[PDB]
Amino acid sequence: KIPAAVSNWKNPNGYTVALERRVTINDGFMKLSEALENADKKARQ
Amino acid sequence: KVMHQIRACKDLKHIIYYKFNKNLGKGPGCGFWQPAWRVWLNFLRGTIPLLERYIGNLITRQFEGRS
Amino acid sequence: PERWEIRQLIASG
Amino acid sequence: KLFPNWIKPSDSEIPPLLVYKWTQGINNLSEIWDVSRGQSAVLLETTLGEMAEKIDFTLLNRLLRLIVDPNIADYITAKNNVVINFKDMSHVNKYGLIRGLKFASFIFQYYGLVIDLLLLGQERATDLAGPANN
Amino acid sequence: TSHRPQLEARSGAKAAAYTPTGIEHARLLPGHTTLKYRKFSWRKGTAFGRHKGYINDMTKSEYHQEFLHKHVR
Amino acid sequence: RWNEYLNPKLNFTEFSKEEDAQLLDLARELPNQWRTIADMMARPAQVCV
């Protein structure tokens, strides 16, 4: 049951349609920023 | 590509006007037309079948029509 | 203006 | 006096005058062209390749808080993270310098400053820029 | 809606039914008229140093990344 | 106006305790990357600010 082919770029017959028919991390950043905070603490110490 | 033959005719001019005019300088009067005549006859030798095919296609478009 | 002429003097040679 | 002498384009010369001063300074070293005792001089040119495309904003923020007020550094690391629209596509530029920013010269020098300190080291850089009072 | 996709092709039955006109083309001139036949201490001040294939996707390939780093500078 | 207020697919509702306690951890982790935190939360950037 193929959907009825609604897209964003070309509306050929000028139909308006229901609006919804138009339209996590690695650990390493925790490894960087924490370490940078650590180094910043050492700098301030 | 007639320019080829035209250049050759100009080039034959540039030879013949400085072997016809050794003691004559500059001016009209030269009429040794033989090799430029040969060059244009060789051009016609080349474009007899060219014009046969071109005008055959044109005349059959005039009578028979476009395929 | 004084500072800019000293800066152009340092920058030139 | 943040940026040392070796960082270019400095405001003191046009790039042909940069080339001329560079050739003069190559000549004006003490016994540079002497090969009598068997010396050797090496001149190396290389591109710091993709330097504006691999700047990490955590590292960049911690580098920029050393030199400016941290409101400015938060502004800079939040300005280099905007959406890049185009005709069709769009993406959040999560890291890497957008060179088209007006102040993106400064970051491209300042981060480049870090690479100089990682190439010259500390001691020779202290030799090159001289003391701070002069 | 004056421009449309193709539903089916112009069939060669429609070209076989037409009577031909003799238009001697520039390329159907006789050429290659023979068929060939076969037989039958100074570096210890710094912070870094030595003292201290193929994938099928073309956009994700190695050559395409070499290309884009070659041609966007 | 579309991608920040009128697109219904991204969430404007009030955040849970989990989302606040992970957004503080992100704002420590990714300091001033508010479009990046917006992509991670699938939420509007200025709303998360």
Ligand SMILES: O=P(O)(O)O[C@H]1[C@H](OP(=O)(O)O)[C@@H](OP(=O)(O)O)[C@H](OP(=O)(O)O)[C@@H](OP(=O)(O)O)[C@H]1OP(=O)(O)O
């Ligand atoms: O302009 P010039 O460099 O002085 O050459 C001319 C020119 O020959 P080009 O075609 O090579 O330029 C004339 O040709 P046209 O101007 O007629 O095209 C030609 O005169 P004719 O063709 O009428 O014979 C004449 O030759 P001349 O005056 O000796 O007859 C010839 O001068 P040069 O002999 O000094 O090259």
